[PDB]
C-alpha cells in the first residue's frame, strides 16, 4: 500500500512534469497529482490536460486541492510527497518546505532529478516565449500545446 | 513489489543515514542497504553496525557490493536508488550521478532531505573529531559509538 | 566598547532569531535589535518589539528599538559600525553577502554572520504564519509568548 | 564580421555593465547594446535617458552601438543577422537563471549566449540596489559612471 | 581578427566538449583547442589531439595544439587574449569564475563561457571512463571515433 | 574583555586574510590569529615563516597576536578562555563548508563562529592558487602583502 502525492500548479503541465509523473507511478502503488489552487488555465482545464497525458498510467489519478498540502496528503491516508528538482534553487527551496512539512505533520518528501532535456523548462517561461511567438511544442504534451495556442488566440 | 537500494560506504553509519533508512523503509516494500567497497571499519563491521541499528525495520536488509551500482540494483530486480541529501553540494553531485545512472541503465534515484538535526554530520568529520577527543555520541547509534571508541584505542 | 546592530522585520520573532540574539549578546558588549518599520505584516512594530523584549528578558546587554531608512545610518547614529545576523542557507549567504559588501562600501559598516542552529534552519516567519493560518502546529519553532499572540491574531 | 547583442534594462547602466561592454567590444567585431523596455512597466529612466547615459560612457568604443527593443530578445538578435548574446555573471543565482534563459533561447531560435565573469570590484552592484541605497541617501557614486550619478540624484529629488 | 583558446584535458573529448567547440568556432574567427599535458590519464596527448581533430574535421577555423604551464602564457604567445569554455553546473561556475578573475588579473586575458547543451550536462570524461570500465554504455555521450578507441583501451 | 580566534593555514597569508584580521580586530577586544599546522604534512612555509609574515603585516593592530597550534581548534579556543572563532567567506562553497564546521564545533564544544564577507577585490584569492600561479611565473604581487611576495618567490627559486 505505497503511495505519494505529486503537487503543483501545472499551468500548464509540461513534459518535465509528465516525466516525473511516470517515474513516480513506476515506483509507488498509487500516485495522486494534486493541482493546487490566478493563471492561464482553470483548475479543471489543468486537471483535464494532465488526465489526457497520463491515460497510460493506471495507478495515477488527478485531483484539485486547497489549504495545507500535508492535510491533503494525510486526509488520503498517505504520508509522502514526490516532486522533481531541476536546479540548486529548486533544491534549496524544496528542502525548506520538506523539512517544515515533516516537522508539522510527519509527511515525508521524495525528490527526483529532472530529465536533462527538460532542465530549463518552466510553465511560466514556456507561456512567455509562446506569447511572443516562440516554438515551445517540444517542451509540452501535444494536447497541451494545442490548448495553449487556443488560449493565446482567444 | 516496490523497492529501492540505499547505497553508501557507511564508515561508520550515522544517525543521519539511519533516519534515511527508516524513511525509505516506510515508503518502499523492500530496502537493500548496499555497502560499497580503505577506511576505518571493514565491510563486515560496517554491515554488522547497520544490521544492529536496523533490527526494528523488517523490510530492510544489508549487503556488500562492488562495481557499477546500477548493475547491483538490476541484478536484484529493482530499478530505484534512494539517498539522503544535506547540502547544495550533495544535490549537485548526486544529480549528476542520478542522470548518468538513468541514462546508462534506466535506474531511477529518489532523494530525501536530511533531518535538520543531522545536516552537518559526515562519517569523516565524526571520525576526525572523535580522534582528537571530541564528543560525537549524539551523532551516532549507541552501538556504533562504542565500536568507534574501541577502534581509536586499539 | 564593542557592539552590533541585529536588524530584521521579526514578524514574528522565531526561536531561530532568538538563538542568534543570545549568541550575539554573548560576544559583543552591546547588541541593539532593530525592528524595521516598512510600507504591511501581521504584528505592529510595537507588538514585535514587545515580543522580542519578552523573549530576551535574560539578555541585559541587548536592547530593542525600531528603525527605518538606511540601516547603516541607524548603526552609525548609535555610535556602532557593525551589523550581526544569522544565515540559514546558500541563498541567505548570497543575498546577505551582496548587502554586506554594499553596506561596507557606502558607509564602512561591517557585517558579522553566524550559522543557524541546525534545528531551526528551515524556519521563516512567513512560512510559520502560513502554516499556522491553515492550522499547522508551529509551537516548537516560536517562543512561548509569541505562539499565544499568534493564535490570537489568527482568530 | 563577428557580432553580439548585450541585453539589459540598464535602468541605470552601472560600472559593472560598462566593464562588460568594453570586454565584449574587445572580442567581437560589433556589439549592439540592447535596451529592453517593458511597455507595461516604466522604470526610473525613460528609454532616451537610458540610451543617452550608455552612449556618453561608451564614446571610446567605436564598434559599439545602442538600440532599444522589446519582445523576444532572440528576434532582436536575428533581425540584425546575428546569433550571439553576450552578458556578465556575478553570482551563482545569475548563473542558474541565465543558463535557463540561454538554453531556452538556443532551443527556440538557435541563438547562443556567451557569458563573462564580473569584475571583482563590482560583483555586489545592481541597478535596483544602487537606486534603493541612493533613495535613502547612500553614496553610490563609485558604482556608476559620471553619465549616471547626478541624473539619478535628479530623479530622486 | 577575433579568436579564443579552448583549454582542457579532453581525456577523452566528449560530445559536450564538441558542442562547445562548434559553438565557439561559429562565433570567433579562430579557435585553438589547447590539450593540457599534465603530471596521468587514459589517452596520450597525441591520442587526445587526434580524437579531437577527427571530431572537428568540419571546423576549418579550429585547430588543436598541446600546451603546458600557465594558460595565459599559451594564449598570449599566440596573439590572442581570450579563453572560451563551457559550464555545466554551479560548481563549474564558481570554480571557473575564480580562475577567470585570476587570469584576467595576472595577464589581462578574458574568459567567455557558454552554457552546456542540456543533453550533456551530466557528462564528464572521468565518469564516462568509470562507467565504461565496468561495462556501462556511454556511446551516446562520446563521438563515434572516441568510443571505439575507448573500447580498445579497456581491453 | 571580548575575544576571537582567527584560524587558518596561512601558507602564505594573503591580503584577503589581512583584511579580515583588521576587521576582526576592530570589533573584538582581542584577536588571536591561530596558525594551524598539520604535523603530518608540511606546507610551503615553516610555522616560524608563516607567523613572521603575519606579524610583519599586522604591526599596526595592537590587539592582535599570533600563535600556532594543531589538533582541534575548539581546544585552542577554550584553552585561552575564549569561545568565538572569526573568519571570512568568499564563495558559496566556503559558506557550505564553514557552516558544517561551525555547527560541528558548537555541537561538540559550545564554541561559536562569526563570519565576515570577503572584500570584493580579493574574492578570487586563495593561497593555493597564488602559489600555483607564481610557480609558473604569474604576477601575484597585488594579492599578497609585501611581507610575503619575495619570500614566496624565494621558495619557488
Ligand atoms: O515550475 C514549473 O513551472 C515547471 C514546469 N515544468 N517543470 C519541470 C521541468 C523539468 C522537470 C520537471 C518539471 C517545472 O519545474 C517544477 C519543479 C518543481 C516541481 C513542483 N511540483 C512538481 C511536480 C512534478 C515535477 C516537478 C515539480
Ligand atoms: O557522507 C557521510 O559520511 C555522511 C554521514 N552521515 N550522513 C548523513 C547526514 C545527514 C543525513 C543523512 C546522512 C552523511 O551524508 C551522506 C549524504 C549522501 C548519502 C549517500 N548515501 C546515503 C545513504 C543514506 C543517507 C544519505 C546518503
Ligand atoms: O526570514 C525569516 O522570516 C526568519 C525567521 N526566522 N529566521 C531564522 C531561522 C533560523 C536562524 C535564524 C533566523 C529567519 O531567517 C532570517 C535569516 C536572516 C536574518 C535577518 N535578520 C536576522 C536577525 C537574526 C537572525 C537572522 C536574521
Ligand atoms: O542586475 C543589475 O541591475 C546590474 C547592474 N549592474 N550589474 C552588473 C554588475 C557587475 C557586473 C556586470 C553587471 C548588474 O548585474 C546584471 C548581471 C546580468 C546581466 C544582464 N545583462 C547584462 C549586460 C551586461 C552585463 C551584465 C548583464
Ligand atoms: O570535465 C569533463 O571531464 C567534461 C567532459 N565533458 N564535459 C562537458 C560536458 C558538457 C558540456 C561541455 C563539456 C566536461 O565538462 C567540462 C566543463 C568545463 C570545461 C573545461 N574545458 C572545457 C572545454 C570545452 C567545454 C567545456 C570545458
Ligand atoms: O583559502 C585560502 O587559501 C585563502 C587565501 N586567502 N583567502 C582569503 C581571500 C579573501 C578573503 C579572505 C581570505 C583565502 O580564503 C580563505 C577563506 C576562509 C578562511 C579560513 N580561515 C580564514 C581566516 C581569515 C580569513 C578567511 C579565512
Establish whether residue D122 lines the binding site of ligand 4, counting it when its CB lies within 6 angstroms of any ligand atom: yes
Q: Which of E81, E113, E118 sits opposite D114 (nearest CB)?
A: E113
Element (H, E) at C77: helix C71-77
Active-site hit among F127, F131, F147, F151 = F127
Q: How far is the CA of F86 from the centre of ligand 6 (A)?
A: 11
Smallest CA–CA distance, residue C122 to chain A, in Å, is 5
Q: Please, are residues C128 and B125 in contact by the beta-carbon 8 Å criterion?
A: no
> Is B53 annotated among the ligand-binding residues?
no
Residue C123 CA: nearest ligand 3 atom is 9
> Is the CB of residue E90 less than 8 Å away from at least one CB of chain F?
yes
Beta bridge partners of B81: B5, B109
* Site of grid cell 516496490: B2
Asked if D142 is an interface residue toward chain A (Cβ–Cβ < 8 A), one would say: no
Is C139 annotated as a binding-site member? no
Q: Which three cell numbers stand for residue E145?
A: 571515433
Chain E contact probe: residue of F124, F137, F142, F144 with most E CBs at under 10 A: F124
Using a CB–CB cutoff of 8 Å, tell me whether E151 touches chain D: no
Count of C-beta atoms within a 10 Å radius of residue F69: 19
For residue E60, report the phi and psi dihedrals to the nearest 5 degrees: -70, -20
With CA atoms as reference, report the closest residue to D51 among D108, D12, D25.
D12
Candidate list D17, D50, D131, D149, residue with the active-site label: D17
Most distant CA pair in chain D: distance in Å? 46
Name every residue whose Cβ is closer than 8 Å to that of residue A120 and which is 6 or more positions away in sequence.
A86, D99, D100, D101, D103, D104, D107, E118
Look at strands D112-117 and E110-115 and give their pairing: antiparallel
Torsions phi, psi for E80 (to 5 deg): -115, 170
* Burial (0-12, 13-18, 19+ Cβ within 10 Å), E38: exposed
Tell me how far the alpha carbon of residue A15 lies from the centroid of ligand 2, in angstroms.
31
C-alpha cell at D140: 553610490
Classify residue B42 as exposed, middle or buried by CB count within 10 Å of its CB (0-12, 13-18, 19+): exposed
Provide the shortest C-alpha distance from residue B154 to chain C (in Å).
33
**Which among C135, C95, C130 has a CA at the least distance from the CA of C11?**
C130
Is D147's C-beta closer than 6 angstroms to any atom of ligand 4? no
Give the nearest chain A residue to E116 (CA atoms): A116
Ligand 4 pocket member D58 (CB < 6 A)? no
Point out the ligand nearest to the CA of residue C100. Answer: 3
D108 touches chain C (CB under 8 A): no
Work out the number of other CB atoms within 10 angstroms of the CB of residue E144.
9
As given in the structure block, the three cell numbers for residue F78 are 577554550
Residue D101 CA to residue E151 CA, distance in Å, equals 37
Specify whether the CB–CB gap between D77 and D84 falls below 8 A: yes
CA separation for the pair F17, E129 (Å, rounded): 40
In this complex, which chains have at least 3 CB pairs below 8 Å with chain D?
A, C, E, F
B135 CB-side CA count, 13 A: 6
Q: How far apart are CA B48 and CA A75, in angstroms?
A: 39
Distance CA D49, CA F6 (A): 49
- Please tell me whether residue F26 adopts helix, strand or coil conformation: helix
The whole-angstrom separation of Cα C63 and Cα C59 is 8
* Cα D130 to the center of its chain, rounded Å: 15
Residues 6+ apart with CB under 8 A from E82: D27, E2, E3, E4, E5, E28, E75, E109, E110, E111, E112
Length reported for chain A: 154
Q: Return the exposure string of F102-122: e unless at least 16 CB atoms fall within 10 Å of the residue's CB, then b.
A: bbbbbbbbebbbbbbbbbbbb
3-state secondary structure of C23: helix
Compute the nearest-CA separation of D103 from chain E (Å).
7
Pocket of ligand 3 (CB under 6 A): C 6-8, 14, 16-17, 20, 85-86, 88, 92, 116, 120, 123-126
Kindly provide the b/e burial profile for residues B89-100, where b requires at least 16 CB atoms within 10 angstroms of the residue's own CB. Answer: bbbbebbbbbbb
A88 neighbourhood in chain D, CB within 8 Å: 92, 96
- Torsion angle in degrees (nearest 10) through CA of D53, D57, D60, D63: -50
| F64-69 sheet: strands from edge to edge | C62-67, C30-36, C3-8, C82-87, C110-115, F112-117, F84-89, F3-8, F30-36, F64-69
Distance A119 CA to ligand 1 centre (A): 9
Whether D17 is catalytic:
yes
Nearest-by-Cβ selection for C89 from A71, A92, A103: A92
Sequence ranges of the binding site of F for substrate: 9, 41, 73, 87
SS (H, E, C) D143-154: CCCHHHHHHHHH
What contacts B93, CB < 8 A, 6 or more positions away?
A: none
Residue F17 known to be catalytic: yes
Give, for ligand 1, the residue of A9, A12, A14 to mutate: max count of ligand atoms closer than 8 Å to Cβ.
Answer: A14
3-state secondary structure of A91: helix
Interface check D104 vs A, CB under 8 A: yes
Helix extents (H) in chain F = 15-27, 47-57, 73-78, 92-109, 127-135, 146-156
How far is A142 from chain E, CA to nearest CA, in Å?
Answer: 21
**B41 Cα to chain E: minimum distance (Å):** 25
CB atoms within 10 A of CB D12: 24
Q: Is D127 a catalytic site residue? A: yes
Ligand whose nearest atom lies closest to the CA of B116 = 2
Could you tell me the CA-to-CA distances from D113 to A16, D6, D82, E24, E26 in Å, in that order?
23, 10, 11, 10, 12
CA closest to C91 among chain B residues = B88
Q: Structure solved using which method?
A: X-ray
With contact defined as beta carbons under 8 Å apart, do D14 and D149 qualify? Answer: no
Neighbour tally for B8: CB within 10 Å: 18
The answer to whether the Cβ–Cβ distance between C136 and A105 falls below 8 Å is yes
* C-beta atoms of A103 and C134 within 8 A: no
D76 and D105 in contact (C-beta within 8 Å)? no
Question: Which residues of chain A have a CB within 8 Å of the CB of E119?
Answer: 116-117
**Which residue, A48, A8, A72, A20, is CA-closest to A150?**
A48
Do residues D121 and D93 touch, judged by C-beta distance below 8 A? no
Identify the nearest ligand to the CA of C22 by its number.
3
Task: Tell me the CA–centroid distance for residue A97 and ligand 2, in Å.
Answer: 20
User: How far apart, in whole angstroms, are the C-alpha atoms of residue E129 and residue E121?
Assistant: 16
Ligand nearest to the CA of F14: 6
Q: What is the DSSP string of C116-146?
A: PPGGGTT--HHHHHHHHHTT---TTTS-HHH
Alpha carbon F88 to chain centroid distance?
9
Verify whether residue F106 is a known catalytic residue: no
Q: Which chain A residues in 48-87 lie under 8 Å from chain D, judged by CB atoms?
A: 87
Find the radius of gyration of the CA atoms of chain B. Answer: 15
Ligand 3: centre distance to CA C122 (Å):
10
B129 inside 8 A of chain A by CB: no
Cβ distance of D108 and A129 shorter than 8 Å:
yes
Q: Give the cell for residue F85.
A: 572563532
| β partners of residue E74 | none
> How far, in Å, CA of D26 to CA of D5, rounded?
14
Distances (CA, A) of A78 to A39, A74, B27: 28, 5, 10
Residue F99, chain C, CB below 8 Å: the answer is: yes
Strand pairing of C110-115 and F112-117? antiparallel
Which residue has the least CA distance to atom 15 on ligand 6?
Answer: F126
Amino acid at each position: 500500500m505505497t503511495g505519494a502525492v505529486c503537487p503543483g500548479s501545472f499551468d500548464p503541465v509540461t513534459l518535465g512534469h509528465l516525466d516525473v509523473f511516470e517515474r513516480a507511478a513506476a515506483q509507488f502503488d498509487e500516485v495522486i497529482v494534486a493541482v493546487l489552487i490566478a493563471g492561464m488555465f482553470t483548475v479543471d482545464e489543468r486537471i483535464e490536460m494532465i488526465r489526457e497525458s497520463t491515460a497510460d498510467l493506471p495507478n495515477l489519478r488527478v485531483e484539485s486541492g486547497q489549504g495545507l498540502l500535508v492535510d491533503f496528503v494525510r486526509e488520503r491516508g498517505l504520508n509522502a510527497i514526490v516532486k522533481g528538482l531541476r536546479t540548486g534553487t529548486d533544491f534549496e527551496y524544496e528542502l525548506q518546505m520538506a523539512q517544515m512539512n515533516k516537522h508539522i505533520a510527519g509527511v515525508d518528501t521524495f525528490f527526483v532529478a529532472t530529465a536533462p532535456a527538460y532542465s530549463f523548462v518552466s510553465s511560466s517561461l514556456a507561456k512567455e516565449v509562446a506569447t511572443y511567438g516562440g516554438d515551445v511544442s517540444a517542451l509540452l504534451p501535444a494536447s497541451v500545446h494545442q490548448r495553449l495556442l487556443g488560449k493565446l488566440r482567444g
